[PDB]
Design a binder for this molecule. Structure first.
Ligand SMILES: [Zn+2]
Ligand SMILES: [Zn+2]
Ligand SMILES: [Zn+2]
Ligand SMILES: [Zn+2]
Lengths: 276, 275
C-alpha cells in the first residue's frame, strides 16, 4: 500500500468537513491534510469548541478518510524568530494551540514552516529566536507526544533535507522529524536524490508538487524541474513506507475536483513507473 | 511540566468516563490503556465506531488523555511464534491496534519485546520476531503511529542498548523507546549510562520499583531502583516527556489511597532530583 493524500486547499473551500472528506474518498484519496494558515478563518480552528473538534473526529471515523497531518503555515505571519516579542509570543501560542488541537482530533503530524521571519529581513537575532522557539515547541510536543515535522522550504534557512537534519541533530528529540517537499527540495542547488536518501530514518511524510527556481507555488505538474520518477524510485529503494500528499491550490479553479483528478492520475502514473 | 500518568490497572475495573474523572481528581494528566492477554481487553480492538467515539468524547470532556497503549497481548500471540497461525493472529492484533490508535487518537503503542514468552526462544523465533517488527513498523509508517519498544523482564530486550540495536536496524522514525526504569534496574545493566544513551529515542517512561528477578508489585522504595538518580539523569539529559506510574492497586485495600501515596512519593523523588 501507498497512502495518498490531498491538500485541503486543492478542494472547495467550505468549512463543511464531512463533505470535504466524502469528496476526497470519491476522488480516491486516503487522507486530507488540514491547513492552519495565515488567514483568520483557518486560524480560528484553534479556537474551535469541543463539539466542533468532536464533529471532525466523527466525520473522519464515519468516512474512513483520515486527517493525519496539519500544515501550520500560520508561522509565516507569526514567525518564531520575530524580534517583535509580541509577534513571537503569538507564534508560540499558535504552536501550543495547534498541539492541543492535534491531541483533540488525533492529528499525527504537525508540519512546521522553517521561517525564522518571512515578511521581515532575517539576521542572527531572528535565527537565534527561531532556534529557541523551535526547542520550546518540541518540548511542548514531547509532553503531548505529537510529532512535529519540519518542511523543506521555499526559504534559504530550511531549503534542504541537510539543513533540517542539522536542526534534528541539535534538538535530538524523537518528536522532531522531517517532512520533505520534493518541489521545494528541487528548486535550489541541492543533490536531491542524495538528500532523500540521507534523510530516510527521519522522513514521516512527503509533499508532492512541481516547482521552478524561485517559483514554489502553482507550477503545473510536468512544467517544472522536479524529477518525480527519480524521487519516487529513490524513496522506494531506500525503504520509505509512509504517505504522499499532493500539494496544489485548485480550490479557486472552475472545477477543483476535475483539476485534482488529473493531478492524481498524473502523479500515480509516475509512482507506478517508479515501481510503486 | 512533568506530565504524570496512571496505569489503567492502578484504578478500579469498569466506564471510561468514570475512570478518567477518577484520574483527574487524583491529579493525573493521563491514563495508559492496557490491551493485555485477556479476551476482555482484547475485545477493545473490535470495538464499534460508536464505542471508539464515546472514548474520544470522554477524553475531550475530562481533559485526561489516553496517549498510550500497553500492548501486552503479544505474550499470548507473539510475533516470533513458529506456529504460523499464532504469528498471524499477532500480526492482525498489531494491525488492529494501530487502527484503534488512529481512531481514538492514541499517540504511542508500547510494544512487548518478546519473540516468544510461553515457549523457548531460538534462532527461528528471533528471525520471525525481527520480520514481524519490520512488518509492524511498515504499518505504523503508513498510519503515522509511534511504536515504542518497552525495556523488558526478558533477556531479548532487557536494556535500552538492546532496543537501540533494533532501532538502528529498523532506521524508521516510528520505532522508538519506552524505558521502564524498574525492568532496566532488575538486571546487570549500567542504568544511568543506558538512560543517557537512549535519550534521543525516549518517548515515555514507566515508573515502578523492582528487585532482581522480581519485576512486579514491589512497593515503591523497597526495591533496588535509584529513583532520584534516574530522574536526575533524565532531567540533565534533557528528557521532557511523560512519566507513567505503573501499579496494580486496582485490587488493593484502598486503590485511590494507594495511588495518592505512590503519586506523592514519586513526586518527592522527582523534587529531590531538581524536577
Ligand atoms: Zn539523523
Ligand atoms: Zn509543501
Ligand atoms: Zn539512535
Ligand atoms: Zn513497564
Amino acid at each position: 500500500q501507498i497512502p495518498l493524500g490531498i491538500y485541503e486547499k486543492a478542494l472547495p473551500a467550505g468549512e463543511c468537513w464531512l463533505e470535504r472528506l466524502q469528496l476526497a474518498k470519491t476522488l480516491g484519496f486516503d487522507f486530507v491534510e488540514m491547513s492552519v494558515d495565515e488567514t483568520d478563518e483557518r486560524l480560528s480552528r484553534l479556537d474551535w469548541s469541543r463539539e466542533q473538534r468532536l464533529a471532525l473526529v466523527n466525520a473522519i471515523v464515519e468516512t474512513g478518510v483520515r486527517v493525519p497531518s496539519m500544515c501550520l503555515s500560520a508561522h509565516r505571519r507569526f514567525p518564531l524568530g520575530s524580534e517583535d516579542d509580541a509577534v513571537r509570543a503569538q507564534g508560540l501560542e499558535i504552536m501550543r494551540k495547534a498541539i492541543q488541537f492535534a491531541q483533540d482530533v488525533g492529528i499525527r503530524v504537525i508540519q512546521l514552516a522553517g521561517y525564522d521571519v518571512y515578511y521581515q529581513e532575517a539576521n542572527n537575532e531572528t535565527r537565534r529566536r527561531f532556534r529557541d522557539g523551535l526547542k520550546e515547541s518540541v518540548e511542548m510536543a514531547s509532553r503531548a507526544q505529537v510529532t512535529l515535522a519540519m518542511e523543506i522550504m521555499d526559504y534559504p534557512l530550511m531549503n534542504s533535507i541537510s539543513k533540517a537534519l542539522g536542526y534534528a541533530h541539535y534538538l535530538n528529540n524523537p518528536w522532531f522529524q522531517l517532512y520533505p517537499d520534493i518541489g521545494n527540495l528541487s528548486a535550489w542547488d541541492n543533490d536531491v536524490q542524495m538528500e532523500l536518501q540521507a534523510g530516510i530514518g527521519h522522513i514521516v511524510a512527503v509533499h508532492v508538487k512541481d516547482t521552478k527556481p524561485g517559483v514554489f507555488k502553482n507550477v503545473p505538474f510536468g512544467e517544472g524541474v522536479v524529477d518525480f520518477e527519480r524521487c519516487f524510485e529513490t524513496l522506494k529503494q531506500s525503504g520509505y513506507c509512509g504517505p504522499y500528499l499532493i500539494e496544489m491550490w485548485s480550490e479557486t479553479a472552475e472545477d477543483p475536483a476535475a483539476e485534482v483528478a488529473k493531478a492524481r492520475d498524473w502523479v500515480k502514473a509516475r509512482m507506478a513507473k517508479a515501481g510503486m
